[PDB]
Design a protein around this ligand. Sequence first.
Ligand SMILES: *[C@@H]1O[C@H](CO)[C@@H](O[C@@H]2O[C@H](CO)[C@@H](O[C@@H]3O[C@H](CO[C@H]4O[C@H](CO[C@H]5O[C@H](CO)[C@@H](O)[C@H](O)[C@@H]5O)[C@@H](O)[C@H](O[C@H]5O[C@H](CO)[C@@H](O)[C@H](O)[C@@H]5O)[C@@H]4O)[C@@H](O)[C@H](O[C@H]4O[C@H](CO)[C@@H](O)[C@H](O)[C@@H]4O)[C@@H]3O)[C@H](O)[C@H]2NC(C)=O)[C@H](O)[C@H]1NC(C)=O
Ligand SMILES: *[C@@H]1O[C@H](CO)[C@@H](O[C@@H]2O[C@H](CO)[C@@H](O[C@@H]3O[C@H](CO[C@H]4O[C@H](CO)[C@@H](O)[C@H](O)[C@@H]4O)[C@@H](O)[C@H](O[C@H]4O[C@H](CO)[C@@H](O)[C@H](O)[C@@H]4O)[C@@H]3O)[C@H](O)[C@H]2NC(C)=O)[C@H](O)[C@H]1NC(C)=O
Ligand code: HEM
Ligand code: FUX
Ligand code: FUX
Ligand code: MG
Length: 335
Amino acid sequence: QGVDPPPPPGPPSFTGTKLVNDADHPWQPLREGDIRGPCPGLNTLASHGYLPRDGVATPAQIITATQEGFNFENNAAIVATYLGHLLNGNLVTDLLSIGGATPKTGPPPPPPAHAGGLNVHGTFEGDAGMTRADEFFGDNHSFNQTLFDKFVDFSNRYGGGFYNLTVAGELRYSRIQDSIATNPEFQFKNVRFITAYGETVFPINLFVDGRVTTDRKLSMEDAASIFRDMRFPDDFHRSAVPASNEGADQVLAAHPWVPGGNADNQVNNYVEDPDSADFTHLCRLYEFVVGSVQELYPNPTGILRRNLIKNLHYWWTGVNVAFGGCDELFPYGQL
Ligand SMILES: *[C@@H]1O[C@H](CO)[C@@H](O[C@@H]2O[C@H](CO)[C@@H](O[C@@H]3O[C@H](CO[C@H]4O[C@H](CO[C@H]5O[C@H](CO)[C@@H](O)[C@H](O)[C@@H]5O)[C@@H](O)[C@H](O[C@H]5O[C@H](CO)[C@@H](O)[C@H](O)[C@@H]5O)[C@@H]4O)[C@@H](O)[C@H](O[C@H]4O[C@H](CO)[C@@H](O)[C@H](O)[C@@H]4O)[C@@H]3O)[C@H](O)[C@H]2NC(C)=O)[C@H](O)[C@H]1NC(C)=O
Ligand SMILES: *[C@@H]1O[C@H](CO)[C@@H](O[C@@H]2O[C@H](CO)[C@@H](O[C@@H]3O[C@H](CO[C@H]4O[C@H](CO)[C@@H](O)[C@H](O)[C@@H]4O)[C@@H](O)[C@H](O[C@H]4O[C@H](CO)[C@@H](O)[C@H](O)[C@@H]4O)[C@@H]3O)[C@H](O)[C@H]2NC(C)=O)[C@H](O)[C@H]1NC(C)=O
Ligand code: HEM
Ligand SMILES: O=Cc1ccc(CO)o1
Ligand SMILES: O=Cc1ccc(CO)o1
Ligand SMILES: [Mg+2]
């Protein structure tokens, strides 16, 4: 009949560096039924047992795993996790797939809600990623070697053979241009416009070993290990401080860009959307997502309504801080 979802964990008691690729968290191969998806962070946490190895977890489990494994900052974890859960998880069982659809998330919600997992395109997952291809080309979740070869190429061209903040700026822009030129359904607005800049610095802030204090840069070997194999580098130590999207601003500044998309199902036809969230209008992302949730859940009652109310509030607790203050919305009233 369902679960009563607890509030998110706070930051970890210990926030320093530590060995996370340790004897208790060994890499293991996929078994039948195990789910993996478009996020190399969650994928690696699952394949080392920081998350359930089957790739289905509670919000609380995801938050604690991102903190334990990578020192992902608490509010960034809350913002990402409840966004993913509201849109793509099962609110009644309190379970989210980190990939595609699975019976492991329990009885399906009422359509148009789906609990289809992080693989679901168009409100969270989106276009112009680093190692995943746009959904238009048929697969938005698998590692793509051609794209990784570009990652390596740009690292050679701008980062001395390593991925650093200069590389991030160049790659992000070039990937947007690729999608403009080749994907007639290319969208780069609302959630995706914001998350895409954060994700380009996570490799620097979170995939670089925490004992590297200066000149933080990621080797192609370490990049392949995480992005392709879902495996921590040998002896991997997490960031020495909670971290998330530091430097994303510089990535945008290197190639200023405006949210929008290819209009009218044509390539090379990018039109700005002035209503979209952007980095000086972050609260629009909050409002947009709450609207999306209402479309998924037009008239909930009982446990589903209760858990929607709680999850919306949990998400707001992170958004309020991360976005610098947003008025909470109550589309379903209060408990
Ligand atoms: C990501 O990774 C990449 C790759 O590792 C990394 O890139 C490095 O980035 C730093 C800067 O962020 C680079 O260092 C800087 O280079 C600047 C450009 O240098 C060129 O021009 C210099 C200026 O020449 C003057 O004099 C000549 C007369 O000789 C004149 O004609 C010119 O017009 C001009 O007025 C020149 O000195 C320099 O050449 C020297 O060094 C090279 C070796 O690479 C050597 O071949 C030359 O013979 C010569 O000795 C070069 O051609 C430069 O302006 C800048 O200088 C500032 O700092 C230094 C020291 O701190 C001061 O002394 C100076 O006054 C300046 O204020 C600095 O050196 C570095 O070269 C990049 N490395 C590579 C491999 O690309 C990114 O930083 C990474 N990103 C992140 C975020 O980490
Ligand atoms: C891994 O991910 C990569 C990258 O996303 C996938 O490769 C892309 O595949 C798409 C689909 O085939 C390619 O898109 C097509 O591009 C053509 C033009 O490309 C040329 O120019 C680029 C540079 O701009 C060169 O790099 C490239 O080599 C080409 O020379 C267009 O002609 C195509 O458009 C036609 O169909 C669409 C859809 O209906 C219409 O909108 C168009 O008007 C037109 O009629 C198309 O857009 C894309 O070029 C590929 N990129 C690269 C780098 O290869 C891989 O498929 C994927 N790997 C696997 C195996 O999954
Ligand atoms: C906290 C919960 C998390 C959720 C719900 C989440 C969700 C997602 C989703 C849906 C994507 C796909 C977006 C796309 O490229 O289309 C993604 C991409 C990504 N995530 Fe996460 N993520 C989380 C945590 C993390 C952490 C902790 C890290 C790093 C340690 C991380 C690093 C990345 C990177 C680098 C990508 C981009 C991959 C690429 O473009 O090739 N994420 N994540
Ligand atoms: O992949 C994770 C992600 C994207 C954007 C944010 C903000 O916490 O986290
Ligand atoms: O600046 C944008 C943004 C989105 C999510 C977060 C917090 O990590 O910051
Ligand atoms: Mg994507």
